[PDB]
Assembly symmetry: D2
Homo-oligomer: 454 residues x 4
Amino acid sequence: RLRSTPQDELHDLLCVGFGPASLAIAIALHDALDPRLNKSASNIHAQPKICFLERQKQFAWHSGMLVPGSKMQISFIKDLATLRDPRSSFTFLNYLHQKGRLIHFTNLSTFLPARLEFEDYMRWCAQQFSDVVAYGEEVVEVIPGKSDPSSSVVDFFTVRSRNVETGEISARRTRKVVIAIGGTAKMPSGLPQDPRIIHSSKYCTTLPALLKDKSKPYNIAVLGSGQSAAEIFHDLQKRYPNSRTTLIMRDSAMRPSDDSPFVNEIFNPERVDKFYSQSAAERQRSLLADKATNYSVVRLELIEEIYNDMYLQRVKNPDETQWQHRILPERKITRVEHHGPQSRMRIHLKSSKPVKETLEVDALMVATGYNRNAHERLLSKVQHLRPTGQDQWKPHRDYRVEMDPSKVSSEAGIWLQGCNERTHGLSDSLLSVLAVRGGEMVQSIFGEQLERAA
Amino acid sequence: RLRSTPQDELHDLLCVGFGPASLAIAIALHDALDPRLNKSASNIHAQPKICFLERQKQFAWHSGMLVPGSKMQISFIKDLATLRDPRSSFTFLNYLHQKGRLIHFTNLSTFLPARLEFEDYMRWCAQQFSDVVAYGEEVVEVIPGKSDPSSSVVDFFTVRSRNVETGEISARRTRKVVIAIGGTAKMPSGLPQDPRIIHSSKYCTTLPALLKDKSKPYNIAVLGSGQSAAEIFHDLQKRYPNSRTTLIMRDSAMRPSDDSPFVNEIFNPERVDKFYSQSAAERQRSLLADKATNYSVVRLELIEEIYNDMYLQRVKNPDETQWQHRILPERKITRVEHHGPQSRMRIHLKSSKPVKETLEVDALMVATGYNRNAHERLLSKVQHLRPTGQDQWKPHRDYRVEMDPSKVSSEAGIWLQGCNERTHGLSDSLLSVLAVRGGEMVQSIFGEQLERAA
Amino acid sequence: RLRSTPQDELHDLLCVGFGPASLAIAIALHDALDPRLNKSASNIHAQPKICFLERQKQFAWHSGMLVPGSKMQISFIKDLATLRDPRSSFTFLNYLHQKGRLIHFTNLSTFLPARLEFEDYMRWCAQQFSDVVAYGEEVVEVIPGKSDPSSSVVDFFTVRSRNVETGEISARRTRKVVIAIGGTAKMPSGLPQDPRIIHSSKYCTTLPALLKDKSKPYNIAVLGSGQSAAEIFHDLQKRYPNSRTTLIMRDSAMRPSDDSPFVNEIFNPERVDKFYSQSAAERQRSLLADKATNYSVVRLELIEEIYNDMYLQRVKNPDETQWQHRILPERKITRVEHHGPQSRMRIHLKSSKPVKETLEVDALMVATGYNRNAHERLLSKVQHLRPTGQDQWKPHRDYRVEMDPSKVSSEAGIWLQGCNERTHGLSDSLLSVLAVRGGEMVQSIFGEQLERAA
Amino acid sequence: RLRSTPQDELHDLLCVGFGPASLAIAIALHDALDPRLNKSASNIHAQPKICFLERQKQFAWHSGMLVPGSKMQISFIKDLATLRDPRSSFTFLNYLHQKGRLIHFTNLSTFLPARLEFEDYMRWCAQQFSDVVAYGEEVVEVIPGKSDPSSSVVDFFTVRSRNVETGEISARRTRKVVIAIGGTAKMPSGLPQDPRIIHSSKYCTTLPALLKDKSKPYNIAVLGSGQSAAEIFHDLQKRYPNSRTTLIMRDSAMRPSDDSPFVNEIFNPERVDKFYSQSAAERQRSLLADKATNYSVVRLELIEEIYNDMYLQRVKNPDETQWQHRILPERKITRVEHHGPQSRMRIHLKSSKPVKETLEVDALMVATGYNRNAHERLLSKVQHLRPTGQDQWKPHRDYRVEMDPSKVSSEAGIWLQGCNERTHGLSDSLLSVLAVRGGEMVQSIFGEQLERAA
Ligand SMILES: Cc1cc2nc3c(=O)[nH]c(=O)nc-3n(C[C@H](O)[C@H](O)[C@H](O)COP(=O)(O)OP(=O)(O)OC[C@H]3O[C@@H](n4cnc5c(N)ncnc54)[C@H](O)[C@@H]3O)c2cc1C
Ligand SMILES: Cc1cc2nc3c(=O)[nH]c(=O)nc-3n(C[C@H](O)[C@H](O)[C@H](O)COP(=O)(O)OP(=O)(O)OC[C@H]3O[C@@H](n4cnc5c(N)ncnc54)[C@H](O)[C@@H]3O)c2cc1C
Ligand SMILES: Cc1cc2nc3c(=O)[nH]c(=O)nc-3n(C[C@H](O)[C@H](O)[C@H](O)COP(=O)(O)OP(=O)(O)OC[C@H]3O[C@@H](n4cnc5c(N)ncnc54)[C@H](O)[C@@H]3O)c2cc1C
Ligand SMILES: Cc1cc2nc3c(=O)[nH]c(=O)nc-3n(C[C@H](O)[C@H](O)[C@H](O)COP(=O)(O)OP(=O)(O)OC[C@H]3O[C@@H](n4cnc5c(N)ncnc54)[C@H](O)[C@@H]3O)c2cc1C
Ligand SMILES: NC(=[NH2+])NCCC[C@H](N)C(=O)O
């Protein structure tokens, strides 16, 4: 139903990225314009001029970490529509019904679909917006624009994207921009660059290209102790059955993720209001107090599964140093030799406490998480539009960043999505509040036009 | 939206009973007439003349067995709309959203709502049809009618109902009837009539009236080993903390209900087709082979809970004969003395194998299940409209009973709901297929009118 | 401590088979002779002359079905000593302590060790009796003996065993014999002999020899729906990742094993008394009523795991006929073509109801359970010592078979172990009562000598 | 077997307290002297002169917190003997066997006995040492003694105890002392003294005496968010069915206890060596990093149970302020009015963040945990025997406190048990290492005598 806008026309909304965050906005807009769900939508005149720019060739949801068997870490009810409107055609349950699979999923008695299934649910959602999404487009910069060039008022933005295949630059003009680009791979600064040192985000993509023979006796190390590291470490024994694997962590042990009901309530959509209204001190204190819900934590079932495997090695061999798969707690990497004639790097280890063994490995999987600062690069040319002296983007409750009112028209603005954890809570980078947030976003961006019909 | 029909007018549909079975038909009709869900509904002219007759004063779902804590025995996905259309406003999830309770239910991580909650979900559904439901109306008979009295063709039915409060008889004429009246309480024929002998269906209703003091030291017996007996036996220790309870069963032990996924697939809506198409031999054989999914079975968690309580008695006292709460396996009642001057009846027991103890009790809770033959009484006057010599109602796949084509107009008919287990499967008397069956029913009854618009 | 008896000497006890049943007798005897556990053992004079004959080269516990990951189906508390005496050095917990593994097993929070671990526990037990066990000895016949050849009284037995490696026959004389030889592989009589048709008992042993390349695209069928079939079917997708597998069952679905607490109590050691004392009618009726505890049943977790895998195939492909791993319910094999030039047999299928597809397979795994009648062949020459006209062995409560008192001395006898399900219950062929039964056996066999010391 | 020593004689060991810690020492000594378990014990000459002093009238294990239904928070394998020797007659499993209850406990499939059952297991253990335990004896002071009064060398200690019933002081002389007195109730310093303000440790003891009518409509508050608070809060709705309850916590939510396998390994007996050998910095850092295993945490099942109850209140009433049972997160008590004429105290609340409601309550249950500094009072007169200038007791690895070698004979010493968390780990105050620690203690105290026999 959402028809495309020609590249040359001034858009109402331009969204950078087409992952879950932007997809949920697209769904919310569809629903707000659906007369079947929003009775006032029968009176809307023109369709808003909207466009989504995605750098991937097609919709994919963390494809490099689509480890076989890997499950969702959130209830399917927290899909892209249900918490806002269970009547929506974009719910996970309606998707299953459409695929002829609803009765079968029911028989599984689980709230946790496979990652592979949930990606397909979101792929199914994404495809219905193909006319308004430009794939293979990496946005490189956002530039302020003045429709009256002689004035001192900014009232639009130019979004410039590089074609991933051809390398050419395109420009699209919009009144309002949304940055929903997720996070970048975080690597420890001490580790050197080498094709054998690969971030977890590229596990399914890059590793099989490097270690082509699945039956060879490789030595493979994993750095980290989060969900990503545990998943890779568990997968390696299956993917490379004859390989010797090592898990290197600086903590003493893998620790369970906390989804206990009372604690879990921080992820409730209505709690964003309460969290935002807290002071910087209480917000920082609150984030630290509830960290075990999301960061440096592993799902209990996975910890137990790994532990069980470790015990089975003990049954077969009482000598820990002879085990095929090992875990080295409270260790840090101090040096990596990678200029030797052999295919194996040499990793020097020490205690993580305030010296130890050396490992020879064919590959080092680095599962050290993500940073969320990629938007900063894209927004460098619009920095001067912030209030004088303010050197950081300040998102409001509605995610619209603060800009000097005397420099920027009220019709122009920039919204940030999925990088606002410090201001909005631990549900910000997740799927938790996407259905509800998407609806709030549509009301914040298209509210004026939707009021005319209401 | 469904407007009432005056009592004097010829109805298109008259439904006897307004429990889940009829409620799901009402919901399906609403949805078939909703242009938002069925695009062809924009062209329908007149609303069908429909009426539901319910004997209870208001909607209640097995209120006599609303034991505190009692849970659902089926996934909430198998509600009254979802398996047919997850977009419907009558889904369990939309209900929760409407009550402002969806995020909270999500945090429970359960597919099994409390019975109390699910009744309220269905109460919420039922209330939106209050204009087309006549409460306090017990249907007593269905009578064949001929619009041309001199002809030999029946083309309508008179439905006669007794007002529960006033005792007066009313009559409503309809082309099509649905009998969806559930089941009647089954009592062992050997047990005599006494106010102290109460069926499980009346546990919350009748027992507190008989045993008014909750702190008194009563002796209370429970007969049976199904879900009802286990629930009552478990509840009694809480409801009457100082009472001595006994569970009398003829089996050796309580046995778990089977909801293992492969086995559970017999409850799939599309399987009704496959089950109906089987022969009488294969259907009888199939029902017997899968009995542990529904009959004489208890949910595992409840069995374990009871067992745990029994063990705690063993910790406190190694003498089984001194226990406050006891279970007597493989026993049958042979005689009940109930003419003695005391308040306690005397129950004589024997082995159930092809003699034993005597119990003195203030009340005997009889949890011996249900029969489904109440429709037979209401349909006695229409029996002669069946094909010559046929002494049982033969429901088709679409639940319409066979009638002689030369005696009954094609516009007239009678449908049976919830009593067709032998022909339609073990999902027939349950909630399992209600959403889908309701939709099939609407197509079978109102199909002609809905085709004109489609 | 148990010293060996020379082959030529008259033994007090000769045991045929050294599996769990006989191992538990050996342990019980050790414990009865241990002054630390039985205070009267300080006064015993001579060690009884005992010998165990085992056909396997060394102790192994169903080695052909040691599928990777396969777990125990019984609590570790029901090991070979604990239920009789938790102080015994032969308990599972003491074994773990001896291996330096007790604290680690504790951290697993499971009552269900790996099959591989529990076999090693029993191997550990078995090794301490190596001096009184003759491995590589297959017993072929038991012969009545008369120390006075001119009399008509039997007072000993000759046990004849064939050396598995050399083929020679040895003879050992004993007053008392125990037959504890477990069960033989049951094959459907309709299936023809072929190296590609293999019983489940030989899965780990025989299949890898036939299908040597684990990466080849084989077609592999599994017949059955018990624990063995489910385990093999689940394992095949891992063992042969590129092979197309089929599960052929005559039932409609895999059904869960019943270990619900009240029901499980039939396995209690003290219940053997109660079960034995029942009539043939009640025993047959009782066995049939509780069949789901042991036969044609699969552990719930495994059913769910398989079901989950099947659903994952549905996610990837909605076409069931294209799935790599398939299950064909309610089917029976009617013909097997196996004289064709290709490596694949052709299996003709029909409905199991009172016609279907053809499968081409490289191997057929037959998981159709076991028979327990091997003792009959070994006892043919002693049949005439039973009471006149009695054509079946009648074991007493103490497992000693009935023999004519005028033909057999009171000092001579034959005991049956693990084949007495019809007389002793569903715990007879299991590990359930082994600790307690072993102790009863020692008292039944060595009671006279142990009374002198007591 | 352990015979009593007359009060006047010099003891080898005097133990202050007869709870789990001391009980495990008694058991270890029994086992070390049992020739059946320790082969060298056949050669020991004299029984050591040992005595245990307990202030309670008889053995009781946290009797004031024996809330109905309350379960163990540790595997039964970590009983008072098993991890040291599974052959011991003092194991939990042997206890069950002795009570005729082993097969039944097995059928529960749980590692977590009821608190009531486990106390009875330890009561059963304790009774076999009744001849060497003096009940009703509260130790008040430990005094250094010099057998040569003119010398400057201490070589014994006088232990002085007050009879709880009569008030008289008794004195017992010993070479070696063990202080195993557990912890004292910790109350917030801001709360005033009042009979209506009761510590959790006295919940079952003191509250029913204050609130005698269980059916009255009381207002009852609970302060805290640990296991104790959750247990009391959950129990109150059952114990006082018509009472309005409030949970006051300064944290945002109840948080789950961590027993994930890898993390749980800190509780392994052999890990005490590794923990003790760490520096003060690493030990403090380690304790803080693993706090969620023991402190301010609730068992997941209990959190969920409470949460479920809270949701059921939401079903019945959407207004949180009308709920019978409520939880007030992030609150602190600032003032308590308790001089008013009514029976209800007035509690003034504020936010716990760096103002709120007032509660009127009949009782305030204070579940604010325990302190472990009671030994300091008893050891004041022996303080000067520590090395010059050292103002804190420094326990060695073997739990023997450091004393000046020139002041104290090598035959004299004082050991601390259950208060050494800072030096020995999080397993110190628990049941976790009691079996193993008890054995280490016996070797540390009676080692010289046991070497003569070995
Ligand atoms: C392996 C993994 C599994 C997870 N699973 C869960 C889960 O089970 N439940 C849960 O609640 N949370 C989960 N998360 C958290 C995760 O952040 C969210 O599920 C989700 O990815 C957030 O969506 P987003 O759109 O904000 O970011 P993303 O999903 O990363 O979407 C960003 C998109 O923008 C595109 N993009 C980036 N830069 C540019 C550019 N310059 N120009 C154009 N396009 C660009 C990217 O290609 C990407 O498609 C998971 C995270 C990971 C890494
Ligand atoms: C205690 C209990 C709990 C259950 N819980 C579950 C569950 O968890 N999940 C599940 O799938 N199945 C469950 N069932 C099965 C149950 O049959 C269905 O949930 C459901 O009740 C079937 O609906 P129905 O309309 O066919 O029958 P009913 O629900 O019995 O509805 C029949 C209605 O017709 C009315 N009526 C009867 N006779 C007349 C008359 N002569 N005139 C007018 N009105 C009349 C009655 O008042 C009643 O309201 C349960 C059954 C019981 C007894
Ligand atoms: C794969 C599998 C797994 C099982 N797991 C469980 C479980 O988890 N828990 C449970 O309670 N039950 C289980 N069982 C049931 C099983 O019957 C018992 O665990 C156990 O094997 C019974 O011991 P047994 O000594 O009676 O028979 P077996 O264990 O079969 O021992 C018989 C021994 O006698 C030897 N023998 C046979 N014939 C001769 C001869 N002519 N001469 C000399 N020696 C001979 C055999 O080599 C064998 O070693 C399992 C069964 C199978 C097939
Ligand atoms: C309610 C509760 C439940 C618990 N449950 C668990 C559990 O499930 N698992 C677990 O591992 N840990 C648990 N714990 C931890 C607990 O500390 C240990 O289980 C155990 O109590 C430690 O034993 P102890 O002998 O060191 O201390 P205690 O058990 O407190 O024993 C001290 C004894 O010394 C006596 N005493 C004190 N002062 C004197 C004196 N001056 N003179 C004479 N006698 C004195 C006391 O009467 C008492 O009997 C629990 C703690 C509490 C409060
Ligand atoms: N199929 C099975 N699960 N067999 C094992 C049965 C063991 C039995 N439930 C017991 O506790 O002793």
